[PDB]
Amino acid sequence: EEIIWESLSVDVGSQGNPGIVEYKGVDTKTGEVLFEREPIPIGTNNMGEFLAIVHGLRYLKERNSRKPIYSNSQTAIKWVKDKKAKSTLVRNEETALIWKLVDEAEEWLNTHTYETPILKWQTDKWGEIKADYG
DNA sequence: CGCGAATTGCG
DNA sequence: CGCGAATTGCG
Ligand SMILES: [Mg+2]
Numbered sequence: 139e140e141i142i143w144e145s146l147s148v149d150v151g152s153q154g155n156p157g158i159v160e161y162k163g164v165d166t167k168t169g170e171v172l173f174e175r176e177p178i179p180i181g182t183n184n185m186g187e188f189l190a191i192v193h194g195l196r197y198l199k200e201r202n203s204r205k206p207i208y209s210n211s212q213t214a215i216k217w218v219k220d221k222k223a224k225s226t227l228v229r230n231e232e233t234a235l236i237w238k239l240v241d242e243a244e245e246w247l248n249t250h251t252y253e254t255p256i257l258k259w260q261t262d263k264w265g266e267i268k269a270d271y272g
Numbered sequence: 273c274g275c276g277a278a279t280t281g282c283g
Numbered sequence: 284c285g286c287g288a289a290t291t292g293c294g
Contacts, residue, residue, distance in 0.1 A: 155273050155294095182274055183294080210294085213275050226274070261294095273294105280290070 141264055142257070143167040147208040148194050150186035151271035156227060159186035159236065163194045164269045166208060173197050181227065181236030187214035188223050192243035195252050206255035210267045215256055221247040 145166040152159055159181040162174040173193055178186070191214055194207045209215055217223045223240050227233055259267045 157273090184275060211275095213294095216276075224275080275293090278291080281288090283285090 139260070141166075142206055142208075145206045145208055145257075146172060146194050146198065147259065147268040148187070148190035149210060149267050149269035149271065150183055150190060152183045152186065155183045156180055156233075159183065159189075160271075161186050161190035161193070162269055163190065163197065163207075166268050169268055178236050178239065180233050182225060184211065184213050184217075185223065185225050185227065185236055185240055187211035188217045188225075189239055189243055191215070191218045191256060192246060195250075195254055195256075196246065198254050199250070199252055204253060206257050208257050208259040208267060210259045210261055212258060215258060218247065218256060 143166055146163050147166045148161060148163045150159055150161045158177045158179060160175055160177045163172045164170060165172060187209060191207060191209050198205060221244065223244060225240065229237050261267065
């Protein structure tokens with residue numbers, strides 16, 4: 139399998155797991171930032187990766203783009219394809235925002251179709267995903 | 273740490 | 284014993 143350069147890559151920037159979560163999606167070739175989510179005060183890295191993929195799906199659907207999405211998170215890819223985020227994060231006032239976003243992303247998946255291929259970024263083969271925060 | 277996949281007590 | 288609940292590599 140080879141890299142599809144005409145694609146979108148997503149990744150999460152964490153400050154702890156659980157901890158603050160942000161994410162972005164970038165053009166795999168150029169690095170152009172296409173969308174970003176401001177820091178969510180608490181969530182898990184997995185929840186962030188899930189939100190990042192779904193955000194990418196919504197972005198690409200709006201623009202009628204057929205570009206694939208790359209994610210380095212096998213867990214998030216599975217959650218998106220299952221249309222179910224199997225997170226164990228406690229639901230309380232502290233985590234209300236991340237769970238609101240996750241619940242809404244699930245609702246979107248369960249009420250829409252999409253053509254975007256969702257592909258695993260192979261870090262061991264290809265180096266850093268283009269959306270990496272460092 | 274959180275995940276999926278795997279391995280490990282009370283009916 | 285079964286069936287699951289809970290425990291035990293990778294990022
Ligand atoms: Mg990541």
